[PDB]
Amino acid sequence: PTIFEERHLKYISQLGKGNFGSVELCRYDPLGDNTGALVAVKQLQHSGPDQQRDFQREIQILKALHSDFIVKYRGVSYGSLRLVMEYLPSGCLRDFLQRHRARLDASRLLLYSSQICKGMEYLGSRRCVHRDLAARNILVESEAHVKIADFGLAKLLPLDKDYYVVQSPIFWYAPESLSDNIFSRQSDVWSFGVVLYELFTYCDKSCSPSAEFLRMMGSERDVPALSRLLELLEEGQRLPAPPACPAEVHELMKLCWAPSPQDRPSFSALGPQLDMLWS
Ligand SMILES: C[C@@H](NC(=O)c1c[nH]c2ncc(-c3nn(C)c4cc(F)ccc34)nc12)C(=O)N1CC(C#N)C1
Ligand SMILES: [Cl-]
Ligand SMILES: [Cl-]
Ligand SMILES: [Cl-]
């Protein structure tokens, strides 16, 4: 049931690509008659020992997570460890928002925000820091239902600590991650703020997190991009209000980007502030 035999995975195509892996559309087809279910299967690429041990942790985390707003674990395949997950054909929210922009109103973006916030509230209850929350890592189950995916960089908080010192794009990172490699549930709140930005810009590439920040951080100097972003964030620079973003939603974004981790709201606090907008 939870064990998928390698030789019955029929490879269709590649869904998405990570730094140390890919997610492939496969049909698990034991009967050989093409009646089997389509599934999304992660395998490692360009992998050394460190990424292998990370993958073993990631499988166990995903396996232990049970939420309507978190992508479902199906099983694993050995032979060559592979992680089998539910296939959501509508794909990722990043592509979905660009594709269906003309039909997706503010109220629907708020639905997605609220569901992501719930998933993130659930993650915090399991003491799990996602570390790579972004629109590219949210999947569409239906028009009115999204789920958090990609637990490849996810860390369980130690039982006696609410932070972890430990690479995704720097433009979703909290200042304390940028500066001291510190990650926490409130580091995820910083990222969620950027996700809210993505939603309300419909993931338009002309005003993406990187496009906005890259423009702020000058042409070039003998200074790395990381230091210059940290400098701007310490000067109080933030992503702007998206075109036609509701005032109140932009204000929630700014609360997610409070300099101090303890001054950012909890997902539990954010949830009702998202749901009660416009009611
Ligand atoms: C975001 C993650 N996707 C998953 O974990 C998925 C689990 N079930 C899925 N069902 C569908 C998809 C997916 N479909 N389509 C059309 C996509 C297009 C994309 F750009 C990304 C993901 C998908 N991804 C998934 C992914 O693509 N990667 C993690 C990295 C690794 N390894 C690459
Ligand atoms: Cl087929
Ligand atoms: Cl199917
Ligand atoms: Cl579906």
Coordinates of C-alpha atoms and ligand atoms in Angstrom, one line a residue:
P1 CA 0.0 0.0 0.0
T2 CA 2.6 2.5 1.2
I3 CA 5.3 0.5 -0.7
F4 CA 5.5 1.2 -4.5
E5 CA 7.6 -1.3 -6.6
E6 CA 10.0 0.6 -8.8
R7 CA 9.4 -1.4 -12.0
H8 CA 5.6 -0.5 -12.0
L9 CA 6.3 3.3 -12.0
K10 CA 5.7 4.4 -15.6
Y11 CA 7.4 7.7 -16.2
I12 CA 5.3 10.3 -18.0
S13 CA 7.1 13.7 -17.7
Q14 CA 8.7 16.1 -15.3
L15 CA 6.5 18.3 -13.2
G16 CA 9.1 20.4 -11.4
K17 CA 12.8 20.8 -10.7
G18 CA 14.6 21.5 -7.4
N19 CA 18.3 22.2 -6.6
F20 CA 18.7 18.5 -5.5
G21 CA 15.8 16.8 -7.2
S22 CA 12.8 16.6 -9.5
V23 CA 9.2 15.7 -9.1
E24 CA 8.0 13.5 -12.0
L25 CA 4.5 12.5 -13.1
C26 CA 4.3 8.8 -13.1
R27 CA 1.6 6.2 -13.5
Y28 CA 1.9 3.4 -10.8
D29 CA 0.7 0.6 -13.1
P30 CA 1.1 -2.9 -11.4
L31 CA -1.6 -4.4 -13.7
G32 CA 0.3 -3.2 -16.8
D33 CA -2.9 -2.2 -18.5
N34 CA -2.6 1.6 -17.9
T35 CA -5.5 1.6 -15.4
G36 CA -3.2 2.7 -12.5
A37 CA -3.3 6.0 -10.8
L38 CA -1.1 9.0 -11.8
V39 CA 1.1 10.2 -9.0
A40 CA 3.9 12.8 -8.4
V41 CA 7.2 11.2 -7.5
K42 CA 10.3 12.9 -6.1
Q43 CA 13.8 11.5 -6.7
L44 CA 17.2 13.0 -5.9
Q45 CA 19.5 14.6 -8.5
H46 CA 23.1 15.7 -8.2
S47 CA 22.9 14.2 -4.7
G48 CA 25.6 13.6 -2.1
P49 CA 25.3 12.0 1.3
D50 CA 23.9 15.2 2.9
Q51 CA 21.0 15.5 0.5
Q52 CA 20.3 11.7 0.9
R53 CA 19.9 12.0 4.7
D54 CA 17.8 15.2 4.2
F55 CA 15.5 13.3 1.9
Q56 CA 15.1 10.5 4.5
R57 CA 14.0 13.2 7.0
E58 CA 11.7 14.9 4.4
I59 CA 9.8 11.6 3.7
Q60 CA 9.2 11.1 7.5
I61 CA 8.0 14.6 8.0
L62 CA 5.6 14.5 5.0
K63 CA 4.4 11.1 6.1
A64 CA 3.6 12.4 9.6
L65 CA 1.7 15.5 8.4
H66 CA -2.1 15.3 8.1
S67 CA -3.8 18.5 6.9
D68 CA -6.2 19.4 4.1
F69 CA -3.7 22.2 3.2
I70 CA -0.7 20.0 3.0
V71 CA 0.1 17.8 0.0
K72 CA -0.6 14.1 0.8
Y73 CA 2.1 11.5 1.2
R74 CA 1.2 8.2 -0.7
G75 CA 4.3 6.0 -0.1
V76 CA 7.9 5.4 -1.1
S77 CA 9.7 3.3 -3.7
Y78 CA 13.1 1.5 -3.2
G79 CA 15.5 -0.4 -5.5
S80 CA 17.1 4.5 -5.3
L81 CA 14.7 6.0 -2.7
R82 CA 11.7 7.8 -4.3
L83 CA 8.9 9.7 -2.5
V84 CA 5.4 9.1 -3.9
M85 CA 2.8 11.8 -3.4
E86 CA -0.7 12.7 -4.7
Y87 CA -0.7 14.2 -8.2
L88 CA -2.5 17.6 -8.3
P89 CA -2.8 18.2 -12.1
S90 CA -3.8 21.9 -11.8
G91 CA -0.2 22.4 -10.8
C92 CA 1.5 25.2 -8.9
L93 CA -0.2 28.4 -7.7
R94 CA 2.6 30.6 -9.4
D95 CA 1.6 29.3 -12.8
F96 CA -2.1 29.1 -11.9
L97 CA -2.3 32.8 -10.9
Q98 CA -0.6 34.0 -14.1
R99 CA -2.8 31.7 -16.2
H100 CA -6.2 32.5 -14.6
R101 CA -5.5 36.1 -13.5
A102 CA -8.5 37.6 -15.4
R103 CA -10.9 35.2 -13.5
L104 CA -9.3 35.4 -10.1
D105 CA -10.7 38.3 -7.9
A106 CA -9.3 39.7 -4.6
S107 CA -11.7 37.5 -2.6
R108 CA -10.4 34.3 -4.2
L109 CA -6.7 35.3 -3.4
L110 CA -7.9 35.8 0.2
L111 CA -9.3 32.3 0.2
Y112 CA -5.9 31.0 -0.9
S113 CA -4.1 33.1 1.7
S114 CA -6.4 31.8 4.4
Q115 CA -5.9 28.2 3.4
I116 CA -2.1 28.6 3.3
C117 CA -2.2 30.3 6.7
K118 CA -4.1 27.3 8.1
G119 CA -1.6 24.9 6.6
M120 CA 1.2 27.0 8.2
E121 CA -0.7 27.0 11.5
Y122 CA -0.8 23.3 11.3
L123 CA 2.9 23.1 10.6
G124 CA 3.7 25.2 13.6
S125 CA 1.6 22.9 15.8
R126 CA 3.9 20.0 14.6
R127 CA 6.9 22.1 15.4
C128 CA 8.0 22.2 11.7
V129 CA 9.7 25.1 10.0
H130 CA 9.0 24.9 6.2
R131 CA 11.9 27.2 5.1
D132 CA 10.8 27.4 1.5
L133 CA 7.3 28.9 1.5
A134 CA 6.7 30.5 -1.8
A135 CA 3.9 30.5 -4.5
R136 CA 6.1 28.1 -6.6
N137 CA 5.7 25.5 -3.8
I138 CA 1.9 25.8 -3.3
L139 CA -0.2 23.4 -5.4
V140 CA -3.8 23.8 -6.7
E141 CA -6.2 21.0 -5.8
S142 CA -9.2 22.8 -7.2
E143 CA -10.3 26.4 -8.0
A144 CA -11.0 27.0 -4.3
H145 CA -8.4 24.7 -2.6
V146 CA -4.6 25.0 -2.4
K147 CA -1.9 22.9 -0.5
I148 CA 1.6 23.5 0.8
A149 CA 4.2 21.3 -0.8
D150 CA 8.0 20.9 -1.0
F151 CA 9.3 20.0 2.4
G152 CA 12.8 19.5 1.0
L153 CA 14.3 22.1 3.3
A154 CA 11.9 21.6 6.3
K155 CA 13.3 21.3 9.8
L156 CA 11.6 20.1 12.9
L157 CA 12.2 22.5 15.8
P158 CA 14.0 20.7 18.7
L159 CA 11.7 19.9 21.6
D160 CA 13.4 22.4 23.9
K161 CA 13.9 25.3 21.3
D162 CA 11.8 27.6 19.1
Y163 CA 14.5 28.3 16.5
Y164 CA 17.1 26.5 14.4
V165 CA 20.4 27.7 13.0
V166 CA 21.2 26.3 9.5
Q167 CA 19.5 27.5 0.0
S168 CA 16.3 29.1 -1.5
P169 CA 16.0 32.6 -3.0
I170 CA 17.1 35.3 -0.5
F171 CA 14.0 37.4 -1.4
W172 CA 11.7 35.3 0.8
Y173 CA 14.1 35.3 3.8
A174 CA 13.8 36.9 7.1
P175 CA 16.6 39.3 8.1
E176 CA 17.7 37.0 10.9
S177 CA 18.0 34.1 8.4
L178 CA 20.0 36.4 6.0
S179 CA 22.2 37.6 8.8
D180 CA 22.6 34.7 11.2
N181 CA 21.0 31.7 9.4
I182 CA 18.3 31.5 12.1
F183 CA 15.0 29.8 11.2
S184 CA 11.8 29.6 13.1
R185 CA 8.0 29.7 12.8
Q186 CA 8.3 33.5 12.7
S187 CA 10.8 33.2 9.9
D188 CA 8.0 31.3 8.0
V189 CA 5.7 34.2 8.9
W190 CA 8.2 36.6 7.1
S191 CA 8.0 34.3 4.0
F192 CA 4.2 34.1 4.2
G193 CA 4.2 37.9 3.9
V194 CA 6.1 37.5 0.6
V195 CA 3.6 34.8 -0.5
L196 CA 0.8 37.3 0.1
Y197 CA 2.7 39.7 -2.1
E198 CA 3.0 37.0 -4.8
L199 CA -0.8 36.3 -4.7
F200 CA -1.8 40.0 -5.0
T201 CA 0.7 40.5 -7.8
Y202 CA -0.7 37.3 -9.5
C203 CA 3.0 36.3 -9.6
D204 CA 3.6 38.9 -12.3
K205 CA 7.3 38.7 -13.2
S206 CA 7.7 42.4 -13.8
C207 CA 7.1 43.1 -10.1
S208 CA 8.4 39.9 -8.5
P209 CA 10.1 39.9 -5.2
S210 CA 13.5 39.6 -7.0
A211 CA 12.6 42.3 -9.6
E212 CA 11.5 44.8 -6.9
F213 CA 14.4 44.1 -4.6
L214 CA 17.1 43.8 -7.4
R215 CA 16.1 47.3 -8.5
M216 CA 16.4 48.7 -5.0
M217 CA 19.8 47.1 -4.4
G218 CA 21.5 49.3 -7.1
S219 CA 23.3 48.4 -10.3
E220 CA 26.4 46.8 -8.8
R221 CA 29.3 47.3 -6.3
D222 CA 32.0 44.9 -4.9
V223 CA 29.3 43.8 -2.4
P224 CA 27.4 40.5 -2.4
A225 CA 23.6 40.6 -3.0
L226 CA 22.9 39.1 0.5
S227 CA 24.5 42.0 2.4
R228 CA 22.9 44.6 0.3
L229 CA 19.4 43.1 0.7
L230 CA 20.0 42.9 4.5
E231 CA 21.1 46.6 4.5
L232 CA 17.9 47.6 2.7
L233 CA 15.6 45.6 5.1
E234 CA 17.4 47.2 8.1
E235 CA 16.8 50.6 6.5
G236 CA 13.0 49.7 6.5
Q237 CA 12.7 49.0 2.8
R238 CA 10.0 46.5 1.9
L239 CA 8.1 45.2 -1.1
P240 CA 5.5 47.9 -2.2
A241 CA 1.7 47.6 -2.2
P242 CA 0.8 45.4 -5.3
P243 CA -1.2 47.3 -8.0
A244 CA -4.9 47.3 -6.7
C245 CA -4.0 45.4 -3.5
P246 CA -6.6 46.0 -0.8
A247 CA -5.2 48.5 1.8
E248 CA -5.9 46.1 4.7
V249 CA -4.0 43.1 3.1
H250 CA -1.0 45.3 2.4
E251 CA -1.0 46.1 6.1
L252 CA -1.0 42.5 7.1
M253 CA 2.1 42.0 4.8
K254 CA 3.9 44.8 6.7
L255 CA 3.1 43.1 10.1
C256 CA 4.6 39.9 8.7
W257 CA 7.8 41.9 7.8
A258 CA 8.4 43.4 11.3
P259 CA 12.2 43.5 11.9
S260 CA 12.0 41.6 15.2
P261 CA 10.7 37.9 15.0
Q262 CA 8.7 38.3 18.2
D263 CA 6.8 41.4 16.7
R264 CA 5.5 39.4 13.7
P265 CA 2.0 37.8 14.2
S266 CA 1.5 34.2 14.7
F267 CA -0.3 32.3 11.9
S268 CA -3.0 31.7 14.5
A269 CA -3.4 35.4 14.9
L270 CA -3.1 36.0 11.1
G271 CA -5.9 33.5 10.2
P272 CA -8.8 35.5 11.6
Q273 CA -7.4 38.8 10.3
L274 CA -7.4 37.3 6.8
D275 CA -10.9 35.6 7.1
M276 CA -12.6 38.6 8.7
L277 CA -11.4 41.0 5.9
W278 CA -14.5 42.3 4.1
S279 CA -17.0 40.4 6.1
Ligands
LIG1 C1 6.6 21.8 -5.8 C2 7.1 20.3 -6.0 N1 5.9 19.6 -6.3 C3 5.4 18.5 -5.6 O1 5.9 18.2 -4.5 C4 4.1 17.9 -6.0 C5 3.4 16.9 -5.3 N2 2.3 16.6 -6.1 C6 2.3 17.4 -7.2 N3 1.4 17.4 -8.2 C7 1.6 18.3 -9.3 C8 2.8 19.1 -9.3 C9 2.9 20.0 -10.4 N4 2.2 20.0 -11.6 N5 2.6 20.9 -12.4 C10 2.0 21.1 -13.7 C11 3.6 21.6 -11.8 C12 4.3 22.6 -12.3 C13 5.3 23.2 -11.5 F1 6.0 24.2 -12.0 C14 5.6 22.7 -10.3 C15 4.8 21.6 -9.8 C16 3.8 21.1 -10.6 N6 3.7 19.0 -8.2 C17 3.4 18.2 -7.2 C18 8.1 20.4 -7.0 O2 7.7 20.5 -8.2 N7 9.4 20.3 -6.6 C19 10.0 20.2 -5.3 C20 11.4 20.1 -6.0 C21 12.1 18.8 -5.9 N8 12.5 17.8 -5.8 C22 10.7 20.3 -7.3
CL2 CL -0.4 6.8 -19.6
CL3 CL -5.2 9.0 -12.3
CL4 CL -6.9 17.2 -8.6

